[PDB]
Scaffold this active site. Structure first.
Site, short mmCIF file in Angstrom:
data_model
loop_
_atom_site.label_atom_id
_atom_site.label_comp_id
_atom_site.label_asym_id
_atom_site.label_seq_id
_atom_site.Cartn_x
_atom_site.Cartn_y
_atom_site.Cartn_z
N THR A 35 0.85 -1.21 0.00
CA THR A 35 0.00 0.00 0.00
C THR A 35 0.88 1.24 0.00
O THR A 35 1.92 1.27 0.65
CB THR A 35 -0.96 -0.01 1.22
OG1 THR A 35 -1.89 -1.09 1.07
CG2 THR A 35 -1.75 1.30 1.38
N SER A 72 2.06 -2.19 -3.82
CA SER A 72 1.10 -1.22 -4.33
C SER A 72 0.92 -1.41 -5.83
O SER A 72 1.78 -2.01 -6.47
CB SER A 72 1.57 0.21 -4.06
OG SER A 72 2.14 0.30 -2.77
N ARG A 90 -4.62 -1.24 -4.55
CA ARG A 90 -4.30 -2.68 -4.59
C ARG A 90 -4.43 -3.37 -3.25
O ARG A 90 -3.89 -2.91 -2.24
CB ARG A 90 -2.91 -2.95 -5.19
CG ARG A 90 -2.41 -4.38 -4.97
CD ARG A 90 -0.97 -4.54 -5.41
NE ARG A 90 -0.84 -4.56 -6.87
CZ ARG A 90 0.30 -4.78 -7.50
NH1 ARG A 90 1.40 -5.02 -6.82
NH2 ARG A 90 0.34 -4.77 -8.83
N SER A 105 3.83 0.06 2.62
CA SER A 105 5.02 -0.52 2.05
C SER A 105 5.62 0.42 0.99
O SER A 105 6.83 0.43 0.81
CB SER A 105 4.74 -1.92 1.51
OG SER A 105 3.66 -1.89 0.60
N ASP A 140 -3.13 4.29 -3.39
CA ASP A 140 -3.21 3.37 -4.51
C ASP A 140 -4.41 2.47 -4.25
O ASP A 140 -5.02 2.58 -3.19
CB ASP A 140 -1.94 2.51 -4.64
CG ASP A 140 -1.84 1.44 -3.55
OD1 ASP A 140 -1.71 1.83 -2.35
OD2 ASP A 140 -1.92 0.23 -3.89
N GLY A 145 -1.83 -1.57 6.89
CA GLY A 145 -1.76 -2.56 7.96
C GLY A 145 -2.91 -3.51 7.81
O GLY A 145 -3.36 -3.76 6.68
N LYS A 169 -9.22 2.80 -0.61
CA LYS A 169 -8.52 2.85 0.67
C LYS A 169 -8.72 4.20 1.35
O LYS A 169 -8.24 4.43 2.47
CB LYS A 169 -7.03 2.58 0.46
CG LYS A 169 -6.75 1.33 -0.36
CD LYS A 169 -5.29 0.95 -0.25
CE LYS A 169 -4.89 -0.12 -1.26
NZ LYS A 169 -3.43 -0.45 -1.15
MG LIG Z 1 3.60 -1.67 -7.69
#
Ligand SMILES: [Mg+2]
Ligand SMILES: [Mg+2]
Ligand SMILES: [Mg+2]
Ligand SMILES: [Mg+2]
Ligand SMILES: [Mg+2]
Ligand SMILES: [Mg+2]
Ligand SMILES: [Mg+2]
Ligand SMILES: [Mg+2]
Lengths: 196, 222, 198, 118, 235, 204, 246, 242, 240
Positions: free
Chosen positions: B1, B169, B19, B129, B17, B47, B33
């Site tokens: 993320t 992400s 994903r 991340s 993002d 998280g 999100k």
């Molecule tokens: Mg990516």
């Protein structure tokens, strides 16, 4: 973290670096580590951010209630409230706090509450991971009853050294001056303190 | 993320993002999100997914009640204080990491909250991340006094850094803009650079391909 | 492992349960009845941890007998098994779970069909033509997959059971001291005492 | 709050009035044979058009070998019968023997008593 | 929660008194179904009849009740009853037998009669239900927590009058259609009102379709009451 | 040890033109030992379908619990719960057991009776909603399912075609899983009707 | 005091519920009228001092974005009931199904809160009657009255408090099933004039509607399945506009 | 019968139970407190019911923490109950805030506790009035607390049977010494005022008890007046009676 | 029916009505006005007994840094209300991260009063509470709560036995000036206006020891010493 509070002629000064890390990543490079719990009682926090913030919030609440009912709390009273929380919860808290305050009868005072929840009244105090490197420096250059200007210089030099050697410390140097005159917030940038 | 928050001259923008992952598998190619705490207070979480949505709905619900009770627009400092006290109580077990942003009668606010209940304030932030890829962009291009346009561009760019360089992400960019005068604007799929290409072939089967043992109508009604 | 087998033929459910009780190095008893009658037409066999096994069985028995008297009526096998499952499902998340696996055989008088339920200590319930708990299943399921027919009489079922017990005496490492066999049909519950030679 | 208390003459009024409720209830009788016991009760005549299949009858099985009947508040009786049935199952569970009729009576009687000093 | 010197329960008696002022509810049990009919107390042109549910409540897919008394008290009890039904369904994987459900509710009522010093519930119920053990069933419960089973019964106002009328015209081998007729005639004859109009009634049946095997509850929509009130000839 | 791996099983759901499909395998096992070949993992509450994979005891429990909660809902509301609402009820019901969760992967399929919009969703064991519009997959062969579906799927399939696609996805994904299969059931759901098919598949 | 303070009297009356209903009769009139495409609830701001600022006291309250309430009787009892009605909307519904309750179900909850003040130890019943108007997807528009006993009933139109009998009469004449919302607002203003002694303007009268979705009141744009609250309080100036064309 | 329960207001807005509690106080022995230049003095009358009572032994004045004295008239047990609470209340304060409780802080603590006993019908108001005070960070303080929970600061205070004489003598001192009053003068005067107020009850003999908390005479701690100082103050009261 | 807070047959709550009666037992009057950017409360201060320490006799309370409260009623019930309000204001700040508004504290204290109105075992408090501040959202503010659990916002208000005198006085000023506050820039001038209109309405002259004054400005509420008041009395004696 490198944090200190120093008593001088007209009051007390709190200083800190501005770096917070998780491992080797700098999560915040401009943290405000100087925390107000009352008009002229402030603390520097070290240890777990979560713990120290939650403690700081509770003390601030207790001292607001205190003021409502009983008037202005002494710095000793503030330190006592901090101790109480830290001692009684020593098992679940990783918190090291320096309490500094100005008060008309008592002038400038400094208390440190290290990890066990003990309290120690001192002419000045240093704490945080960066402090280890400046025990010698601080013991050698501290005098009682220094001027404001001298005190600002002492903290500046001390913390520039702590910043220089500790990777967990860095960023800007913040200070809070506590005197009869009031409350003064200072800031010093790297390009000033690095070349001392 | 990858999630970011960027303050500008008259407000605050957040972006994320789109994903969702179960380990190395992409479960949702386009989840949202960006969540609403109140009409002009939004947040993004990283998280434990269930945790960030729950801590968002709980506090969103209490903030509504507070607003009704006090006859005042919700403040971002109340969303923060509630979240941090709640998260703290659970000692880290509620794995919610949030960037919370909004406008209220006192101005505009940007905060980060960590799962153990610590908070930070700033003009630009990132979590997830994709955190470091987006922060590298923020640290390169952020200036004091961004216009709305510049801030959207900047935040959008930070999410791209995460999209392209972080395996955690991907897919799209969602933005939400909270300007002081105005209503908050949620911009769903503001950028969509990851369109699946047409497949080489079509896999639709000739009818009857599957062998069937037994068949029957199911009763729904009563 | 204690051996717990059940097979339902056309008009009855047959239960077989090993007779041995073994603690450590010694066989303490070779005539243990690992069964409780729940109601006149419902039988329950059990295996698992030492104290839990009987304690659970009797608790269930107490509760079903209470229901019978309160309602002057006998709960269907399906209902007794749902009740048992729920009790196990509760216990799995409690402080000290019951470690008991059970077979429930019953003759449903309202439907006129026999019924066999297998429930493990987790509260996993399934209804089956034949079932086993523990290691027994590793041999007996494939046997019965081969030899079982839905239209079998009670006597065909006992022959089929004889074959299962023969296999377990041959391949299984522990001496489980034979089985006690119980039949559950429209006339209630009866014990076959002639299984040492058939 | 204490509802059952002592009167100047030494009676517990609420228990005494409880007896009055029994007096008002439909009549029940039991006689014992040489190898049996018979339990008989009367049916009220306030309203009729009753479904006898489903109306709670007056004689109750406490266990397979013990019956209970009563006169007084019908609703009150259900509470006693239930506790009695539970106690019967519990006695089988811990003593591996069904209750004696004396045991079961002593049990019901103690519940009754308990409600006069709580 | 105390006894009178006659051995009577004051608060329970007074609750029963409260109930006799409530609109009459009637239950009739036939061989192929059950009828529930009730008179709404105090009406107005402005009352919304279409979306109204004051005397007839679904307890479950196979059980319903007609209410006489405080509506708010009844809703409390109805809700615990709906729960009890689902606990039973969850425990045994079977729909709850009607008596078991009735006995529980009655026990809750009895409780307020014996401890706590809370007022009893100012409610009487007629239960209409089907199960595979006893087929169609009718029961009655009142603030005392006593309950009884009936082929036909009434609660609320004019029970004595309605009881005598039902006793007169009821016959065991009845069919549901005949029982619908009987219930409406009986209310019609006992009303403290000018005439029995659709907007003063609640109506419901429990029928087991012959070309089926399972049981259907029909809560009559106002329009249908108007129709059935004409069919039976009370226009 | 891993509760999600003890019993076995898979569920998948897809959307099409004015329809949805939901499928599951029939296996119930205890590690290597197959115990039942009749264990269905799809349920319904009025017109709302729920598949559950994971620990079989929890599968059973949650079915019983959602029957309970939807029965009460229908009585109070005087209408059948819609797929969107049910999704929310499953979610909050799972999250309520945050620190002692049910070891399950639920999948919800249905058509909103008012709007006619096809609807699916998925959850993790603590109630986080995966709201995707194409397919949702769950169980011990989730990777296999994700693969099959991503490759096989196209939008706006006719009920008769959506059936082939979902069946093929399920069969081939199952066959690469030691703990899945043993029979399969597929539901084709439209506004007006719901058809149920048992597939023929490898009995190993 | 752990015993019921509302008990039955020999005549079958529940004294305190009756006495509370008397308290409602003494209260300022409020009313509600249901149209085809909306609901209006109205009342009079009977201010206690001209030194008081009457806007700091709303008698009309939002309960959920699609549900509002008004009352007659003891104001403070109303205030706490509103707080509890708002909370129960969340704890018993929104935190479960992620949407707001339909009107009947929320009324049902408020009724329960009042019913309990009628049975629990050591409390008196609430001294209010509420009218609650709302919209929901599946039931459309509705209006409900709730009484101190906990009873509730649906109304096409009704009035409560002081002039309730005369006002119920004036409504019974004027209502039909083809009313647009603007008409219902008109009828509400007329009905309220009969029962209002003093000044009758947008500063002494309180009206709210449950009508169309108000996207301008939402606070945000972007999500299109979310259109805004249907509860709207009319402004002082919106009220006066409808009085001059009376 | 508006006076059967405590939490009952009379139609005129009064609380009859509290008013009756006051009667118990008026019925009591007389006690006083005097605020001096840098401290406080407490004095009380001990009725000698019999020769058998041991002299100097049935102490009435109570210490709270180290710096506060309390004296009361009315139901003695009720006052003890109140001092026990005062002690818990002072310890809890010290524990959290480290400084010994300021007198106004302590006042309100007793105040709130007393007022609580007038809110509920399952409780009776206290049947005492209490005179208390000491030295804190910023001076001497004297307080009086009535059964309603009412309390104010005083220059001088009295309660019980001899209340009116005492107040009249107290009022005089306030006029004759606006500058202040030394702690030793205030002690002497306290012995006088108790002696004068005794006549309202002259049929029994009495023993005198005095205690004080002075910044300069006791270091701001509460101490009992004993031996020489007590005798000299008695001789003063004796001599000034004639 | 007259001993606890249950309804009488006429729908009244007698104990609540009797509690309003207690509010006047002290025989003190008070009033509150809004300035342009302040709020002023004046209350009479009566010290009958010469043995009292004048400094400890007060019915004005500092609830928080920003909120003051004047009470009309006996001191014990007053101090009970002050403590709760202080605690409620401290807790709000801690939980929600901003200073508790005047009106919200008022609504909260009113809610607590309602509870005493409804539960049998609590008696109402015999006090009327007047809350003042300069709210950061709403500007200068007066909110008053009573034993009925009623509360409202006021342009100005007055409380006590001679409540009506003062009310009608102000009512007349606001008929004249047409605005809803005192059009003065300094709080010292607003305090003067307030004392002036207390003098006219009550028909009495006040010395420095007969008055008590509380002033709320942006971010502080404070009370005047005898000397700050004397400076205010001298100033009025030059138009009047
Ligand atoms: Mg990516
Ligand atoms: Mg460094
Ligand atoms: Mg998986
Ligand atoms: Mg396979
Ligand atoms: Mg295989
Ligand atoms: Mg006096
Ligand atoms: Mg009381
Ligand atoms: Mg009360």
């Amino acid at each position: 973290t490198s944090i200190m509070a120093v008593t001088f002629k007209d009051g007390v000064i709190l200083g800190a670096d501005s770096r917070t890390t998780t491992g080797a990543y700098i999560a915040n490079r401009v943290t405000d580590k100087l925390t107000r719990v009352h008009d002229k009682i402030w603390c520097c926090r070290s240890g777990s951010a979560a713990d120290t913030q939650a403690i700081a919030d509770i003390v601030q609440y207790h001292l607001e209630l205190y003021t409502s009912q009983y008037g202005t709390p002494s710095t000793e009273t503030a330190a006592s409230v901090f101790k109480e929380l830290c001692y009684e919860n020593k098992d679940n808290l990783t918190a090291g706090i320096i309490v500094a305050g100005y008060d008309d009868k008592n002038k400038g005072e400094v208390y440190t509450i290290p990890l066990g929840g003990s309290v120690h009244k001192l002419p000045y105090a240093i704490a945080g991971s960066g402090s280890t490197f400046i025990y010698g420096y601080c013991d050698k250059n501290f005098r009682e009853n220094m001027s404001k200007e001298e005190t600002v210089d002492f903290i500046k030099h001390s913390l520039s050294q702590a910043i220089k050697w500790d990777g967990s410390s860095g960023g800007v140097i913040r200070m809070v001056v506590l005197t009869a005159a009031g409350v003064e917030r200072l800031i010093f940038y790297p390009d000033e303190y690095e070349q001392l | 993320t990858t999630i970011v928050g960027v303050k500008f001259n008259n407000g605050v923008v957040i972006a994320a993002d789109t994903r969702s992952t179960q380990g190395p598998i992409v479960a949702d190619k386009n989840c949202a999100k960006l969540h609403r705490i109140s009409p002009k207070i939004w947040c993004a979480g990283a998280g434990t997914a269930a945790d960030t949505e729950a801590v968002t709905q709980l506090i969103g619900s209490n903030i509504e009640l507070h607003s009704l009770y006090t006859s005042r627009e919700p403040r971002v400092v109340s969303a923060l204080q509630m979240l941090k006290q709640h998260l703290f109580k659970y000692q880290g077990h509620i794995g919610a990491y949030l960037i919370v942003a909004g406008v209220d009668p006192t101005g505009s606010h940007l905060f980060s909250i960590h799962a153990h209940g610590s908070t930070d304030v700033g003009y630009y932030l990132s979590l997830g991340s994709g955190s470091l890829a987006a922060m590298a962009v923020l640290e390169s291009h952020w200036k004091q006094d961004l216009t709305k346009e510049e801030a959207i561009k900047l935040a959008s760019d930070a999410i791209q850094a995460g999209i392209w360089n972080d395996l955690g992400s991907g897919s799209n960019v969602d933005v939400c803009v909270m300007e002081i005068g105005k209503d908050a604007e949620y911009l769903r799929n503001y950028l969509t650079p990851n369109v699946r290409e047409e497949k080489q072939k079509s896999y639709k089967f000739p009818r009857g391909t599957t062998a069937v043992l037994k068949e029957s109508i199911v009763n729904i009604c009563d | 492992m204690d051996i717990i087998l059940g097979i339902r033929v056309q008009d009855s459910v047959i239960l077989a349960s090993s007779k041995a009780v073994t603690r450590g190095i010694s066989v303490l008893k070779d005539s243990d009845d690992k069964t409780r009658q729940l109601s006149p037409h419902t039988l329950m066999s059990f295996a698992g941890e030492a104290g839990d096994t009987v304690q659970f069985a009797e608790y269930i028995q107490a509760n079903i007998q209470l229901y019978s008297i309160r309602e002057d009526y006998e709960l269907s096998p399906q209902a007794v098994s749902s009740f048992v499952r729920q009790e196990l499902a509760k216990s799995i998340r409690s402080r000290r779970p019951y470690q008991v696996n059970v077979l429930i055989g019953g003759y449903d008088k309202k439907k006129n069909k026999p019924e066999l339920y297998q429930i493990d200590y987790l509260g996993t319930k399934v209804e089956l033509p034949y079932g086993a708990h523990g290691y027994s299943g590793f041999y007996t399921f494939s046997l019965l997959d081969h030899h079982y027919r839905p239209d079998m009489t009670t006597e065909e079922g006992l022959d089929l059971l004889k074959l299962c017990v023969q296999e377990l005496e041959k391949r299984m490492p522990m001496d489980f001291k034979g089985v006690i066999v119980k039949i559950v049909d429209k006339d209630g519950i009866r014990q076959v005492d002639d299984f040492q030679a058939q | 709050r204490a509802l059952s208390i002592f009167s100047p003459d030494g009676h517990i009024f609420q228990v005494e009035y409880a007896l009055e409720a029994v007096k008002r209830g439909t009549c029940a009788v039991g006689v014992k044979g040489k190898n049996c016991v018979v339990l008989g009760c009367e049916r009220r005549s306030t309203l009729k058009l009753q479904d006898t299949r489903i109306t709670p009858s007056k004689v109750s099985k406490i266990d397979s070998h013990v019956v209970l009947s009563f006169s007084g508040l019908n609703a009150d009786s259900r509470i006693l019968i239930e506790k009695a049935r539970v106690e019967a199952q519990s006695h089988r569970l811990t003593l591996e023997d069904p209750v004696t009729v004396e045991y079961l009576t002593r049990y019901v009687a103690g519940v009754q008593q308990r409600y006069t000093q709580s | 929660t105390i006894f009178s010197p006659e051995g009577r329960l004051y608060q329970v008696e007074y609750a029963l008194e409260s109930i006799s002022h409530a609109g009459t509810a009637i239950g009739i049990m036939a061989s192929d179904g059950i009828v529930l009919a009730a008179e709404r107390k105090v009406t107005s042109t402005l009352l919304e009849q279409d979306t109204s549910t004051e005397k007839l409540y679904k307890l479950n897919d196979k059980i319903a009740v007609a209410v006489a008394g405080l509506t708010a008290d009844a809703e409390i009890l109805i809700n615990t009853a709906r729960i009890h039904a689902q606990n039973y369904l969850k425990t045994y994987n079977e729909d709850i037998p009607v008596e078991i459900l009735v006995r529980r509710l009655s026990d809750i009522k009895q409780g307020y009669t014996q401890h706590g010093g809370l007022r009893p519930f100012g409610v009487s119920f007629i239960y209409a239900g089907y199960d595979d053990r006893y087929g169609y069933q009718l029961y009655t419960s009142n603030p005392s927590g006593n309950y009884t089973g009936w082929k036909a019964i009434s609660v609320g106002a004019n029970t004595s009058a309605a009881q005598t009328l039902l006793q007169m015209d009821y016959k065991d081998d009845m069919k549901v259609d005949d029982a619908i007729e009987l219930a409406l005639k009986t209310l019609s004859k006992t009303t403290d009102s000018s005439a029995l109009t659709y907007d003063r009634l609640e109506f419901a049946t429990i029928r087991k379709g012959a070309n089926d095997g399972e049981v259907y509850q029909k809560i009559f929509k106002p329009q249908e009451i108007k129709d059935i009130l004409v069919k039976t000839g009370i226009t | 040890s891993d509760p999600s791996s003890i019993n076995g099983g898979i569920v998948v759901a897809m959307t099409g033109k004015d329809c949805v499909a939901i499928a599951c395998d029939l296996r119930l096992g205890s590690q290597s030992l197959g115990v039942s070949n009749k264990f269905e993992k799809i349920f319904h509450y009025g017109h709302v379908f729920l598949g559950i994979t994971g620990l079989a005891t929890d599968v059973t429990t949650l079915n019983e619990m959602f029957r309970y909660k939807t029965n009460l809902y229908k009585l109070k509301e005087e209408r059948a719960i819609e797929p969107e609402t049910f999704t929310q009820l499953v979610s909050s019901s799972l999250y309520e057991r945050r620190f002692g969760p049910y070891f399950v992967g639920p999948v919800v399929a249905g058509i909103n009776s008012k709007s006619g919009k096809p609807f699916i969703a998925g959850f993790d064991l603590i109630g986080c909603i995966d709201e995707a519009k194409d397919f949702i997959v769950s169980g011990t062969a989730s990777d296999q399912l994700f693969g099959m579906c991503e490759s096989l799927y196209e939008p706006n399939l006719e009920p008769e075609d959506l059936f082939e696609t979902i069946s093929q996805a399920l069969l081939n994904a199952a066959d690469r899983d030691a703990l899945s299969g043993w029979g399969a059931v597929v539901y084709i759901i439209k506004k007006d009707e719901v058809v149920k098919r048992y597939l023929k598949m490898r009995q190993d | 005091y752990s015993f019921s303070l509302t008990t039955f009297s020999p005549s079958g009356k529940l004294g305190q519920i009756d006495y509370a209903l008397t308290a409602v009769k003494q209260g300022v009139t409020s009313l509600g009228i249901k149209a085809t495409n909306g609901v209006v609830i109205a009342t009079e701001k009977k201010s206690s001092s001209p030194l008081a600022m009457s806007e700091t006291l709303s008698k009309v309250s939002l309960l959920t974005p699609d549900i509002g309430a008004v009352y007659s009787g003891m104001g403070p009892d109303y205030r706490v009931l509103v707080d509890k009605s708002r909370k129960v909307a969340h704890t018993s519904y929104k935190r479960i199904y992620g949407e707001y309750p339909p009107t009947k179900l929320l009324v049902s909850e408020v009724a329960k809160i009042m019913q309990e003040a009628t049975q629990s130890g050591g409390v008196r019943p609430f001294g209010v009657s509420l009218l609650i108007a709302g919209h929901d997807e599946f039931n459309g528009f509705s209006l409900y009255q709730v009484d101190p006993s906990g009873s509730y009933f649906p109304w096409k139109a009704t009035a409560i408090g002081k002039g309730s009998v005369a006002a119920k009469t004036f409504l019974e004449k004027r209502w039909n099933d083809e009313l647009e919302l603007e008409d219902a607002i008109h009828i509400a203003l007329l009905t309220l004039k009969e029962s209002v002694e003093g000044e009758f303007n947008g500063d002494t009268i309180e009206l709210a509607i449950i009508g169309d979705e108000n996207p301008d009141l939402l606070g945000y744009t972007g999500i299109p399945t979310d259109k805004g609250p249907r509860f709207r309080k009319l402004t002082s100036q919106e009220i006066n506009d409808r009085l001059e064309a009376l | 019968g508006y006076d059967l329960s405590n939490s009952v207001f009379s139609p005129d807005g009064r609380n009859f139970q509290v008013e009756y509690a006051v009667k118990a106080v008026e019925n009591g022995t007389t006690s006083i407190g005097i605020k001096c230049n840098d401290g406080v003095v407490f004095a009380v009358e001990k009725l000698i019911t019999s020769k058998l009572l041991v002299p100097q032994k049935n102490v009435k004045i109570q210490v709270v923490d180290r710096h506060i004295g309390c004296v009361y008239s009315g139901l003695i047990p009720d006052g003890r109950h109140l001092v026990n609470r005062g002690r818990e209340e002072a310890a809890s304060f010290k524990k959290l805030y480290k400084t010994p409780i300021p007198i106004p802080a302590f006042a309100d603590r007793l105040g709130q506790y007393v007022q609580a006993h007038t809110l509920y019908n399952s409780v009776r108001p206290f049947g005492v009035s209490t005179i208390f005070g000491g030295v804190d960070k910023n001076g001497a303080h004297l307080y009086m607390l009535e059964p309603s929970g009412s309390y104010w600061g005083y220059k001088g205070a009295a309660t019980g049977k001899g209340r009116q004489s005492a107040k009249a003598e107290l009022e005089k001192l306030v006029d004759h010494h606006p500058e202040g009053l030394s702690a030793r003068e205030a002690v002497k005067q306290a012995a006088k005022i108790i002696y004068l107020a005794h006549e309202d009850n002259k049929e029994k003999d009495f023993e005198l008890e005095i205690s004080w908390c002075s910044l300069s005479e006791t270091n701001g701690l509460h101490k009992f007046v004993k031996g020489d100082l007590l005798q000299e103050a008695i001789d003063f009261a004796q001599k000034e009676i004639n | 029916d007259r001993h606890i807070t249950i309804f009488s047959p006429e729908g009244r709550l007698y104990q609540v009505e009797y509690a309003f009666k207690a509010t006047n037992q002290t025989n003190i009057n008070s009033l509150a006005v809004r300035g342009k950017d302040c709020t002023v409360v004046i209350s009479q201060k009566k010290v009958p007994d010469k043995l009292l320490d004048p400094t400890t006799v007060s019915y004005i309370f500092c609830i928080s840094r920003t909120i003051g409260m004047v009470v009309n009623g006996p001191i014990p019930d007053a101090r009970n209300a002050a403590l709760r309000a202080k605690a409620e204001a401290a807790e709000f700040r801690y939980k929600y991260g901003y200073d508790m508004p005047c009106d919200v504290l008022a609504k909260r204290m009113a809610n607590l009063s309602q509870i005493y109105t409804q539960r049998a075992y609590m008696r109402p408090l015999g006090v009327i509470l007047t809350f003042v501040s300069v709210d950061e959202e709403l500007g200068p503010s007066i909110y008053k709560t009573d034993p009925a659990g009623y509360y409202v916002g006021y342009k100005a208000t007055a409380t006590g036995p001679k409540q009506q005198e003062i009310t009608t006085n102000l009512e007349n000023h606001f008929k004249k000036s047409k605005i809803d506050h005192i059009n003065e820039e300094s709080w010292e001038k607003v305090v003067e206006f307030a004392i002036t209109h207390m003098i006219d309405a009550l028909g009495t002259e006040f010395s420095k020891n007969d008055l008590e004054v509380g002033v709320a400005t942006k971010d502080k509420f404070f009370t005047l010493s005898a000397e700050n008041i004397e400076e205010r009395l001298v100033a009025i004696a030059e138009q009047d």
